[PDB]
Design a protein around this nucleic acid. Structure first.
Ligand SMILES: Cc1cn([C@H]2C[C@H](O)[C@@H](COP(=O)(O)OP(=O)(O)OP(=O)(O)O)O2)c(=O)[nH]c1=O
Ligand SMILES: [Mg+2]
Length: 641
DNA sequence: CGTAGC
DNA sequence: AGTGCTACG
């Protein structure tokens, strides 16, 4: 059955285990965590969860043999210092040591190994959860129990009476079930190693291991570095914005109260509907629940009466002040090592299109520069609150219409290629065509609306929805759709070809080989069929974009790893020259990367990005990247030197 | 389900 | 329930 080897029990056993580990090229280390049971005696305390303490590691390189490694203060001959030195020695790559480390929940394992244990891995990684995601990107988040059931049933009974295996975290990370940390870590390590062998066989069968080891797992490593770094958050430039928007809120409240003649609650939709549609006789739309008070109907009614405009403005600003201001202010970590407050989001890569999202909180869902003025515009935005460390500047690198360039690549539209190769800025052109104005006369919000429209036709938009958004009639929207389709016939050819491919093969192929499965295209419902077709088109295009940005991330990390021989990330800095210097990667926005570059390497690192993002993949269309730098994310300015 | 980003 | 990836409330 289960065979746990207590390595730290005998000196000879420890030495032969170390020799075998050094002679091994594929291991499955893991972590063990227990309760305090009341620091520096049970193990290294885990950052964040002060009630949890690390205990041991579990390494399994085949079969059911789990070699448990103890970092406890207790074999008295083997002290903690030389044991730590040995563990660091066998967990580092050197002299072409092509070792693969299989860790479940690699980001969290890397973080705990760095901050508390003080050791950072440098070998190839083979996270089994990532491979399970690669198999079925649209599937639910893979817990240990799910991957064990779906990829290792014979050894599945090893989890009998183990309710902790169903949690999101690894078996050896949770502070739950009564099982000891050592045994839990050992059984989890055996299970993940065997399941990862099965997953590697499956990926080799599917021809997906290259995209799993060359870009995907290095992208997980980059995301671990991003989680270690965090985003520099300053409350000096956030509290002021919060107070300004609260002042605007109360001003709008008083104005609406004096206009309507009475005080009413804005949050309640029924009261707003009664006040606006009934009392003020505003024209109701076709479609409790007496009237609909959605954003689009309020926007349509903005011109007719001033009050709906104030209501809509109050709703946004309160959405900014509750869904954004509160999550950011609630979780900010003040660390003296960087000398300023930061925020550490949790990077989730299990999205259905290969995109990278952030949970607790969602940083990318921060309101942009929207200007509102009260008794000229203030340009209120919380993006300015993301001030980097002192002596450093945020260096974003926005892809210049990556989605359109990629679509032109797999569509081979001569007109699209020739309009993207130049600095035409097709979004400005379509905005100028729509508004019958000069391209330079367009604004930021107008250009954003134009780009939303253009991507709407690009991914497939109904005539009615395009009419409601564009403010034009349904027939005019249909004629606009037809003109857009006829102008770019290659886009239609690519869309039809990829829809046919999704219907035939049952899935779609990203340009780096990753696949997403859409059974819904075979659904008899016309809604489901059309939704799955548009889902397939956007899935291939957006997965290509996300894989391009992930290749850019891993290439930039490699380039600033070879250069700038300093501490790799703030997590490595706190794992324990003095000046902060590096190209730390702090945020991804689904099309761009934020780098908290130091004030001395602003230009050179930027150039590196402008290389690696440009030559990430040799496409049919040159991938323009605008590198912007600034003292904050809010007011970053373009840099073309 | 409505709304914010991409 | 007819632009899609999300995340939060
Ligand atoms: C606004 C918008 C973006 N997107 C997607 C398309 C791409 O995946 C991504 C674009 O990210 P942006 O970085 O927002 O778009 P861009 O690269 O096209 O251009 P700009 O330099 O003007 O900022 O977001 C939509 O699908 N629909 C929309 O309405
Ligand atoms: Mg962008």
């Amino acid at each position: 059955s289960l065979s746990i080897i207590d390595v730290a029990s005998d000196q000879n056993l420890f030495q032969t285990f170390i020799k075998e580990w050094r002679c091994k090229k594929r291991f499955s280390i893991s972590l063990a965590c227990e309760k305090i049971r009341s620091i520096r005696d049970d193990g290294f305390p885990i950052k964040g969860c002060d009630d949890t303490l690390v205990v041991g590691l579990a390494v399994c390189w085949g079969g059911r043999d789990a070699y448990y490694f103890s970092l406890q203060k207790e074999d008295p001959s083997l002290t903690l210092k030389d044991r730590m030195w040995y563990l660091q020695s066998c967990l580092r790559k050197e002299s072409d040591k092509e070792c693969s480390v299989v860790i479940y929940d690699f980001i969290q394992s890397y973080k705990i190994l760095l901050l508390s244990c003080g050791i950072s891995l440098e070998q190839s990684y083979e996270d089994p959860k990532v491979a399970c995601w690669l198999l079925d990107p649209d599937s639910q988040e893979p817990t240990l129990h799910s991957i064990v059931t779906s990829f290792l049933p014979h050894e599945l009974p090893l989890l009998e009476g183990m309710e902790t295996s169903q949690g999101i975290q690894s078996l050896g990370l949770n502070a739950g079930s009564e099982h000891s940390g050592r045994y839990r870590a050992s059984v989890e390590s055996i299970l993940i190693f065997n399941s990862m062998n099965q997953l590697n066989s499956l990926l080799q069968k599917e021809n997906l291991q290259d995209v799993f080891r060359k870009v995907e797992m290095p992208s997980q490593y980059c995301l671990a570095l991003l989680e270690l770094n965090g985003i520099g958050f300053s409350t000096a430039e956030c509290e002021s914005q919060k107070h300004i928007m609260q002042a605007k809120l109360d001003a709008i409240e008083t104005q609406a109260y004096q206009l309507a003649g009475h005080s009413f609650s804005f949050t309640s939709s029924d009261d707003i509907a009664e006040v606006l549609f009934l009392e003020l006789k505003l024209p109701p739309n076709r479609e409790g629940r007496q009237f609909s008070t959605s954003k689009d109907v309020l926007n349509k009614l903005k011109a007719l009466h001033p009050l709906p405009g104030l209501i809509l403005e109050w709703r946004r600003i309160t959405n900014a002040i509750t869904k954004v201001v509160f999550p950011l202010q609630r979780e900010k970590c003040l660390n003296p090592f960087l000398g300023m407050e930061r925020i550490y989001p949790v990077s989730q890569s299990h999205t259905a299109t290969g995109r990278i999202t952030f949970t607790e909180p969602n940083i990318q869902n921060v309101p942009r520069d929207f200007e509102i003025k009260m008794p000229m515009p203030f340009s209120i935005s919380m993006r300015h609150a993301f001030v980097p460390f002192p002596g450093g500047s945020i260096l974003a690198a926005d892809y210049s219409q990556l989605e359109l360039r990629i679509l032109a690549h797999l569509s081979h539209d001569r007109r699209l290629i020739q309009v993207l190769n130049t600095g035409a800025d097709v979004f400005r052109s379509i905005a100028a065509e729509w508004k019958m104005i000069e391209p330079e006369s367009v604004g930021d919000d107008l250009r954003q609306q134009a780009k939303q429209i253009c991507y709407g036709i690009i991914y497939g938009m109904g005539a009615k929805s395009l009419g409601e958004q564009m403010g034009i009639k349904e027939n005019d929207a249909a004629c606009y759709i037809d003109s857009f389709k006829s102008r770019y016939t290659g886009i239609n050819q690519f869309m039809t070809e990829t829809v046919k491919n999704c219907k035939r093969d049952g899935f779609v192929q990203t340009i780096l080989g990753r696949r997403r499965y859409l059974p819904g295209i075979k659904d008899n419902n016309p809604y489901r069929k059309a939704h799955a077709e548009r889902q397939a088109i956007n899935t291939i295009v957006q997965g290509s974009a996300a894989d391009i940005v992930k290749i850019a991330t891993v290439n930039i990390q490699k380039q600033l790893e070879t250069f700038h021989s300093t501490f790799k990330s703030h997590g490595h800095r706190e794992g324990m020259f003095c000046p902060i210097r590096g190209g730390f990667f702090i945020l991804q926005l689904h099309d761009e990367l934020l780098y908290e570059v130091a004030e001395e390497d602003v230009v050179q690192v930027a150039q590196i990005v402008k290389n690696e993002m440009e030559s990430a993949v040799k496409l049919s269309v040159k991938l323009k990247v605008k590198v912007k730098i600034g003292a904050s994310w809010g007011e970053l300015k373009d840099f073309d030197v």
